[PDB]
Design a protein around this ligand. Structure first.
Ligand SMILES: Cc1cc2nc3c(=O)[nH]c(=O)nc-3n(C[C@H](O)[C@H](O)[C@H](O)COP(=O)(O)OP(=O)(O)OC[C@H]3O[C@@H](n4cnc5c(N)ncnc54)[C@H](O)[C@@H]3O)c2cc1C
Lengths: 131, 15, 661
């Protein structure tokens, strides 16, 4: 039952007890620990100030307009040929493939893999992507 | 002893 | 109740028999419950009767008269109870009109050493029991450490000053028997710091709360952690407080560390993230160039070149996604950092001013125990707390001396007679004293019993002022050595005009240093005439005794000028400064429970001495040398009422031995 906010463990008491100036020793160790952590902070905040400078301007000179293209069911030769290349670059990342092609949903791409398996040697293309 | 305190009677440690 | 309140006012449990009662009434306490309640009622009623009119003797006959049935049934029981109460001083103590005048045939002879309150009280009782009593007193007056200053209309006490509550206090009875002008003391006590300015209310309350928390913690350290020995030496209250304060300082520092440590953990997370973002920004830069180049290839183009533009577009928006989700994470860690930067824990446990004000409360503790806190037993300093009386504390406006003077009425008191040697043997005692004004005039008093009420200070004196022959046994002298005998002093300042707040009885002055914390730390305005009274407590008390009155009065006036203004504070008409440690008949102010001692030492001080037999193989002698005084009473040490009570106890023990129970 210690008073609430006083702090008094057997352990901490023994540490200030067992020597004539363990009191003032404990308190200097911690004073130094505190001084050293404060200079650690100055190091790291000054390091981070310099990094936030090298990020000046964001990525806003390098950002690209949103192209909101109306999705389409008919496969052009152009679109088929974009796909076979997209499959060669990206894996089965059906999302990526679709984003490249510009007007095919993730399902349409998924279907494409089965519909043109034989004709676009898609098994050779994924074997080629892995090596 | 503590009982002698008239001004600002200490309470800490007394039941 | 009225019967139950009589028990309370006599420091007795109303519904239970005490140890002292068990001894005289073994048949009743080992007997059936119903008879105990009859006893208890008879006891409580007889006390009530005495307490309702303590100015006249209460006889067994008048007691029996006023009981109803079934309590007046047994008339030996009523006689046994009445006699017990009279013998132990619970009734017919103090100053009262005797009904049947005192029998002129005196049984037994007692010499009482000292005519302070313990001695006077014992003397009255012993006379009333029919003994022949003589008191030897070294001073030119009675009262001892009740010492009242008198000059003109100025009246101020240099020793005992305050009745510490009437609830349970035998001085209540004495106040109905003697005109003490008892006046309630109001609790309100503002502190003024060294500059002369009120401590502001919020700080005052915070330091006081911290003081009591610190004290509570020393108690916790003592009782729960058994922190009572350190370097093979008993722990003092002063040490314990130091340790507790150090651990609060430790925690303040541990808390800062922990806080700044989580600031670094968060800055290092941010560092890692900012590096990740700087690398990705340069990756985005290059990849934008690659898309720019690929799209500057004007159409018409083959499908690999169209793919190049499209694939780089996708890759560049995907990386712009990552960097957007990372600057989210950047923004939240920067908020967390501004929060911790603005919520630091405390810089210090206590400021300089805080520790000064804390020291005032420590000085107040040094006043109470009349000693530096480094001398107090940690475990036992407050061992008498449960017997605190209830009610307001009161000034004795007549001067407390009115009490001993009244108690001296009709007693054989020899003033200016300093006891030098006490001799006790199996056939009786002789006390050898001298005249304080010419030390060659020697006196020899022969008696059956000696009651020693010499102050603990005097008993401690080395080389001794009083020699015991044979020497006191080691059990007594060791107790005398272990007990503390403290010091405390008073500066009385008498003025032509009141320049202070007439409705405030008490005000503090906070010293600049720990060393001087006791120095003129508390002022009292208690009297009708314009008097202020300042205390010198703690380490200051001993040191201030070797400084002149003019200087001490100077430092008082300096303080008071600071508080009320230089033009408001005239030079006082009369001044007085007590020097209790230097007084050869006191050698200090009052006892305290020293480190290494306990309440049990007070009981050892109270035990009478029994001499060896004169001729060998003679039967065991009776006790010859008895002890009373403030230092002899475990439950009421260091007080006027403890002294009074200790006298009553010894008169009874002595009467039991020499007049028979
Ligand atoms: C500064 C101060 C303030 C106090 N304030 C209070 C207070 O506010 N309230 C309270 O209840 N109590 C207070 N007390 C305590 C109270 O004064 C004592 O506890 C009480 O008066 C002691 O009574 P006593 O009979 O035990 O000893 P004392 O009154 O000292 O009586 C002992 C007698 O022995 C005499 N004597 C000494 N040597 C010899 C010798 N060789 N031969 C013959 N006689 C000798 C002394 O002169 C003295 O008369 C205070 C004490 C002091 C010192």
């Amino acid at each position: 039952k210690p008073p609430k906010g006083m702090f008094l463990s057997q352990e901490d008491v023994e540490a200030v007890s067992a020597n004539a100036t363990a009191a003032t020793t404990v308190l200097r160790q911690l004073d130094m620990e505190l001084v050293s952590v404060k200079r650690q902070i100055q190091n790291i905040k000054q390091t981070n100030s310099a990094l936030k400078e090298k990020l000046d301007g964001g990525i806003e000179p390098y950002r690209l307009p949103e192209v909101i293209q109306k999705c389409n069911a008919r496969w052009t030769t152009e679109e088929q040929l974009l796909a076979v290349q997209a499959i060669r670059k990206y894996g089965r990342d059906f999302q990526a493939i679709s984003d490249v092609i510009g007007n095919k949903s993730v399902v349409q791409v998924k279907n494409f893999f089965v519909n043109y398996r034989r004709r676009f040697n898609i098994d050779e293309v994924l074997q080629e992507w892995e090596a | 002893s503590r009982t002698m305190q008239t001004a600002r009677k200490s309470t800490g440690g007394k039941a | 109740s009225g019967v139950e309140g009589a028990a309370f006012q006599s420091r007795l449990p109303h519904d239970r028999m005490t140890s002292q009662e068990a001894a005289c009434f073994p048949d009743i306490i080992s007997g059936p419950q119903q008879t105990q309640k009859v006893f208890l009622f008879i006891r409580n009623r007889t006390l009530q009767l005495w307490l309702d009119n303590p100015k006249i003797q209460l006889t067994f006959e008048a007691t029996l008269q006023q009981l109803e049935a079934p309590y007046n049934s047994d008339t030996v029981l009523v006689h046994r109870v009445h006699s017990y109460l009279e013998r132990h001083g619970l009734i017919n103590f103090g100053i009262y009109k005797r009904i049947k005048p005192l029998p002129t045939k005196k049984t037994g002879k007692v010499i009482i050493i000292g005519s302070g309150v313990s001695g006077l009280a014992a003397a009255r009782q012993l006379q009333s029991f029919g003994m022949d009593v003589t008191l030897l007193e070294a001073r030119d007056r009675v009262g001892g450490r009740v010492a009242t200053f008198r000059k003109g209309n100025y009246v101020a006490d240099l020793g005992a000053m305050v009745v510490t509550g009437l609830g349970g206090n035998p001085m209540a009875v004495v106040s109905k028997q003697v005109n003490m002008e008892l006046a309630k003391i109001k609790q309100k006590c503002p502190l003024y710091e060294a500059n002369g300015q009120a401590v502001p209310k919020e700080k005052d309350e915070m330091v006081e709360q911290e003081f009591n928390r610190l004290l509570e913690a020393t108690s916790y350290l003592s009782h729960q952690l058994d922190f009572n020995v350190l370097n093979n030496k008993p722990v003092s209250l002063g040490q314990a407080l130091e340790v507790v304060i150090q651990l609060q300082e430790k925690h303040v520092k541990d808390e800062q560390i922990e806080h700044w440590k989580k600031i670094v953990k968060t800055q290092e997370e941010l560092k890692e993230l900012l590096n990740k973002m700087v690398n990705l920004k340069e990756k985005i830069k290059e990849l934008h160039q690659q898309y720019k180049e690929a799209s500057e290839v004007k159409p018409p183009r083959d499908i690999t070149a169209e793919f190049l533009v499209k694939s780089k577009h996708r890759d560049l928006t995907a990386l712009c996604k990552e960097y957007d989700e990372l600057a989210e994470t950047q923004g939240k860690l920067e908020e967390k950092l501004q929060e911790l930067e603005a919520n630091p824990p405390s810089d210090v446990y206590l400021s300089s001013r805080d520790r000064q004000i804390l020291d005032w409360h420590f000085a107040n503790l040094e006043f109470a125990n009349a000693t530096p806190l480094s001398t107090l037993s940690l475990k036992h300093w407050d061992q008498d707390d449960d017997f605190e009386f209830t009610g307001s504390h009161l000034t004795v406006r007549n001067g407390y001396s009115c009490v001993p003077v009244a108690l001296a009425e009709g007693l054989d008191i020899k003033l200016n007679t300093a006891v030098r040697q006490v001799r006790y043997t199996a056939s009786g005692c002789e006390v050898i004293a001298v005249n304080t004004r010419s030390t060659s005039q020697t006196f020899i008093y022969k008696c059956d019993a000696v009651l020693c009420t010499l102050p603990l200070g005097v008993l401690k004196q080395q080389p001794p002022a009083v020699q015991f022959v044979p020497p006191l046994p080691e059990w007594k002298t060791s107790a005398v050595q272990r007990m503390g005998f403290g010091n405390l002093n008073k500066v009385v300042l008498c003025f032509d005009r009141v320049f202070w707040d007439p409705s405030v009885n008490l005000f503090g002055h906070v010293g600049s240093t720990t060393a001087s914390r006791g120095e003129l730390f508390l002022f009292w305005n208690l009297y009708k005439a314009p008097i202020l009274l300042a205390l010198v407590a703690g380490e200051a008390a001993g040191i201030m005794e070797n400084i002149s009155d003019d200087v001490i009065v100077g430092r008082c006036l300096a303080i008071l000028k600071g508080i009320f203004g230089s033009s408001a504070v005239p030079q006082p008409k009369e001044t007085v400064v007590s020097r209790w440690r230097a007084d050869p008949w006191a050698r200090g102010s009052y006892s305290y429970v020293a480190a290494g001692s306990s309440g049990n030492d007070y009981d050892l001080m109270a035990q009478p001495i029994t001499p060896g037999p004169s001729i060998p193989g003679a039967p065991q002698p009776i006790p010859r040398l008895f002890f009373a005084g403030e230092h002899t009473i475990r439950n009421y040490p260091a007080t006027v009422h403890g002294a009074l009570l200790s006298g009553l106890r010894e008169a009874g023990r002595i009467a039991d031995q020499f007049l028979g129970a």
